[PDB]
UniProtKB/Swiss-Prot annotation:
Effect after changing residue 70 to A: Prevents phosphorylation in case of mitophagy. Impaired translocation of PRKN to mitochondria
Lineage: Eukaryota, Metazoa, Chordata, Craniata, Vertebrata
S-S bridge residues: none
Sequence positions bearing (Microbial infection) ADP-ribosylthreonine: 71
Source organism per UniProt: Homo sapiens
Entire-sequence positions represented here: 1 to 72 of 128
Protein name: Ubiquitin
Residue positions where Phosphoserine is found in the record: 70
Origin: domain of life: Eukaryota
Amino acid sequence: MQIFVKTLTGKTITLEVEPSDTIENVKAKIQDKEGRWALAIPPDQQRLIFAGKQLEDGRTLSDYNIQKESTLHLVLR
């Protein structure tokens, strides 16, 4: 499954994920794709949003009915 994430700087990144990937697993992937600048932002200070909802690290994409080609947003927390 492919999803897109909008980063803190508005750049779009494309991720390859399984439907039961956890939000934590998705965040690790985003960290690898993103830039050095973000090297200073701790993981627990960033949150993913989808369809108005704050996504919890331990729940899965499938828990939130996130389907292929969904766009998530990485925001401050």
